[PDB]
Amino acid sequence: APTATLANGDTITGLNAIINEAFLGIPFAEPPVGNLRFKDPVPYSGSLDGQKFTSYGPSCMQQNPEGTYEENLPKAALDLVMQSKVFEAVSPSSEDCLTINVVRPPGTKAGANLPVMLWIFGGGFEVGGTSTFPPAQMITKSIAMGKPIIHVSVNYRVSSWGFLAGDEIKAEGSANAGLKDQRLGMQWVADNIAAFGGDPTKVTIFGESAGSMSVMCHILWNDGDNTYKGKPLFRAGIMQSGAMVPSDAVDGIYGNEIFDLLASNAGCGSASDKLACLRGVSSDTLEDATNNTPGFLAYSSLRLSYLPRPDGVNITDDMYALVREGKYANIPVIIGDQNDEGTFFGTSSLNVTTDAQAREYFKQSFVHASDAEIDTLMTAYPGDITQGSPFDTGILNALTPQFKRISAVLGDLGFTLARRYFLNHYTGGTKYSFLSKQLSGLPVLGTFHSNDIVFQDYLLGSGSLIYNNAFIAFATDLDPNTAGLLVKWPEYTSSSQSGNNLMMINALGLYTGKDNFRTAGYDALFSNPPSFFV
Ligand X SMILES: *[C@H]1O[C@H](CO)[C@@H](O[C@@H]2O[C@H](CO)[C@@H](O)[C@H](O)[C@H]2NC(C)=O)[C@H](O)[C@H]1NC(C)=O
Q: In the complex with ligand X, which residue's Cβ is closer, 355 or 392?
A: 355
Q: In the complex with ligand X, which residue's Cβ is closer, 108 or 300?
A: 300
Pick out residues in 149-188 that bind ligand NAG (CB under 6 A).
Answer: 180, 183
Q: In the complex with ligand NAG, which residue's Cβ is closer, 253 or 313?
A: 313
Residue 260 contacts which entry, ligand NAG, Ca ion, ligand X, none (Cβ below 5-8 A, type-dependent): Ca ion
Q: How many CA atoms lie within 13 A of 347 on its CB side?
A: 15
Q: Which amino acid is at 60?
A: C
Backbone angles phi and psi of 435, in degrees to 5: -140, 115
Q: Catalytic: which of 168, 287, 341, 373?
A: 341
One residue of 3, 222, 264, 493 binding ligand NAG per CB under 6 A: 222
Does 327 help bind ligand NAG (rule: CB under 6 A)? no
Contact 59, 131 (CB under 8 A): yes
One residue of 314, 376, 464, 469 binding ligand NAG per CB under 6 A: 314
Residue 352 contacts which entry, ligand X, ligand NAG, Ca ion, none (Cβ below 5-8 A, type-dependent): ligand X
Residues 394/435/223/252 CA torsion (nearest 10 deg): 20
Among all residues, whose Cβ is closest to ligand X?
Answer: 351
Residue 222 contacts which entry, ligand X, Ca ion, ligand NAG, none (Cβ below 5-8 A, type-dependent): ligand NAG
Does 130 help bind ligand NAG (rule: CB under 6 A)? no
Please state, as a whole number, how many other Cβ atoms lie within 10 Å of the Cβ of residue 161.
26
Pick out residues in 2-21 that bind ligand NAG (CB under 6 A).
Answer: none
Q: In the complex with ligand X, which residue's Cβ is closer, 360 or 477?
A: 360
Q: Catalytic: which of 93, 142, 174, 209?
A: 209
Q: By CB under 5 A, which span of 130-138, 253-261, 381-389, 414-422 interacts with Ca ion?
A: 253-261
Please state, as a whole number, how many other Cβ atoms lie within 10 Å of the Cβ of residue 173.
12
Q: Is 174 a catalytic residue?
A: no
Does 262 help bind ligand X (rule: CB under 6 A)? no
Pick out residues in 284-303 that bind ligand X (CB under 6 A).
Answer: 299-300
Residue 489 contacts which entry, Ca ion, ligand X, ligand NAG, none (Cβ below 5-8 A, type-dependent): none
The distance of closest approach from Cβ of residue 399 to ligand X in the complex, given in angstroms and rounded to an integer, is: 14
β pairing state of 198-208 and 236-240: parallel
Contact 310, 247 (CB under 8 A): yes
Does 33 help bind ligand NAG (rule: CB under 6 A)? no
Q: In the complex with ligand NAG, which residue's Cβ is closer, 220 or 334?
A: 220
Please give the Cα distance from 403 to 388 (Å, whole number): 8
Q: Is 209 a catalytic residue?
A: yes
One residue of 326, 394, 441, 484 binding Ca ion per CB under 5 A: 326
Q: Of 38, 279, 37, 48, which Cα lies nearest the Cα of 165?
A: 38
Q: Catalytic: which of 449, 464, 495, 531?
A: 449
Does 260 help bind Ca ion (rule: CB under 5 A)? yes
Handedness of CA 175, 132, 343, 242 (dihedral sign): positive
The distance of closest approach from Cβ of residue 80 to Ca ion in the complex, given in angstroms and rounded to an integer, is: 33
Q: Is 449 a catalytic residue?
A: yes
Please give the Cα distance from 421 to 320 (Å, whole number): 8
Handedness of CA 460, 241, 372, 534 (dihedral sign): positive
Q: By CB under 6 A, which span of 20-28, 320-328, 349-357, 505-513 interacts with ligand X?
A: 349-357
Does 357 help bind ligand X (rule: CB under 6 A)? yes
Beta bridge partners of 432: 334
Please give the Cα distance from 316 to 312 (Å, whole number): 4
Residue 405 contacts which entry, Ca ion, ligand NAG, ligand X, none (Cβ below 5-8 A, type-dependent): none
Does 199 help bind Ca ion (rule: CB under 5 A)? no
Sheet holding 431-436, edge to edge: 15-16, 21-27, 99-104, 150-154, 114-120, 198-208, 236-240, 333-338, 431-436, 502-505, 510-513
Handedness of CA 122, 127, 129, 132 (dihedral sign): negative
SS3 string, 436-472, reads: ECCCCCCCCCCCECCHHHHHHHHCCCCCHHHHHHHHH
**Residues at the site binding ligand X, with contacts judged by CB under 6 A:** 70, 299-300, 351-352, 357
Catalytic sites, residue numbers: 209, 341, 449
**Residues at the site binding ligand NAG, with contacts judged by CB under 6 A:** 180, 183, 222, 313-314
